[PDB]
């Protein structure tokens, strides 16, 4: 038999939503700070790049990534959610950051370069969180 299962291929899943008209939303002091200070300082950091977009498991040759990580999250998605006023409160946005960091610590090994990057970003995140209004 000449079917060698070379197709169909893998793919990335659809990315998290960044819009949802029926989701409850608010603008709050805390959410404005989350965009203007928290997200924008992490985004500009030289360790941000692995976290600036949904994980492209196809490009990165990480075929196990979406087998292990079932609640993906990234700063591109968070940025867009903040820009779109998607959240109801600060907790929803903070939880997204916490999911992103937790995913990184699940997927990778302590001491890995990616983990060193997440640790540094998480330290900065926690510092900025402490000055939330
Ligand atoms: C092993 O390659 C990677 C592992 C991760 C990763 C990216 C890669 N591949 S890579 O080419 O971006 C890469 C980044 C660093 Br830092 C070190 C080695 C890498 O690939 C070998 O980012 C995410 C998906 C957020 C992750 O949690 N882990």
UniProtKB/Swiss-Prot annotation:
Cross-link (Glycyl lysine isopeptide (Lys-Gly) (interchain with G-Cter in SUMO2)): 67
Expression by tissue: Ubiquitously expressed.
Remaining remarks: JQ1, a thieno-triazolo-1,4-diazepine derivative, and I-BET, a benzodiazepine derivative, have been tested on tumors with success. Treatment with GSK1210151A (I-BET151, a I-BET derivative) has strong effets on mixed lineage leukemia and promotes myeloid differentiation and leukemia stem-cell depletion.
Protein name per its UniProtKB record: Bromodomain-containing protein 4
Gene name of the record: BRD4
Complex and partners: Interacts with p53/TP53; the interaction is direct. Interacts (via CTD region) with CDK9 and CCNT1, acting as an associated component of P-TEFb complex. Interacts with RELA (when acetylated at 'Lys-310'). Interacts (via NET domain) with NSD3, CHD4, BICRA and ATAD5. The interaction with BICRA bridges BRD4 to the GBAF complex. Interacts (via NET domain) with JMJD6 (via JmjC and N-terminal domains); the interaction is stronger in presence of ssRNA and recruits JMJD6 on distal enhancers. Interacts with NSD3. Interacts with NIPBL. (Microbial infection) Interacts with bovine papillomavirus type 1 regulatory protein E2. This interactions may serve for the tethering of viral genomes to host mitotic chromosomes allowing successful partitioning of the viral genome during cell division.
Domain Bromo: 26-132
Recorded domain comment: The NET domain mediates interaction with a number of chromatin proteins involved in transcription regulation (NSD3, JMJD6, CHD4, GLTSCR1 and ATAD5).
Stated role: Chromatin reader protein that recognizes and binds acetylated histones and plays a key role in transmission of epigenetic memory across cell divisions and transcription regulation. Remains associated with acetylated chromatin throughout the entire cell cycle and provides epigenetic memory for postmitotic G1 gene transcription by preserving acetylated chromatin status and maintaining high-order chromatin structure. During interphase, plays a key role in regulating the transcription of signal-inducible genes by associating with the P-TEFb complex and recruiting it to promoters.
Implicated disorder: Cornelia de Lange syndrome 6: A form of Cornelia de Lange syndrome, a clinically heterogeneous developmental disorder associated with malformations affecting multiple systems. It is characterized by facial dysmorphisms, abnormal hands and feet, growth delay, cognitive retardation, hirsutism, gastroesophageal dysfunction and cardiac, ophthalmologic and genitourinary anomalies. CDLS6 inheritance is autosomal dominant. A chromosomal aberration involving BRD4 is found in a rare, aggressive, and lethal carcinoma arising in midline organs of young people. Translocation t(15;19)(q14;p13) with NUTM1 which produces a BRD4-NUTM1 fusion protein.
Residues of the site described as Acetylated histone binding: 108
Compartments it resides in: Nucleus; Chromosome
Family (UniProt): Belongs to the BET family.
Post-translational modification: Phosphorylation by CK2 disrupt the intramolecular binding between the bromo domain 2 and the NPS region and promotes binding between the NPS and the BID regions, leading to activate the protein and promote binding to acetylated histones. In absence of phosphorylation, BRD4 does not localize to p53/TP53 target gene promoters, phosphorylation promoting recruitment to p53/TP53 target promoters.
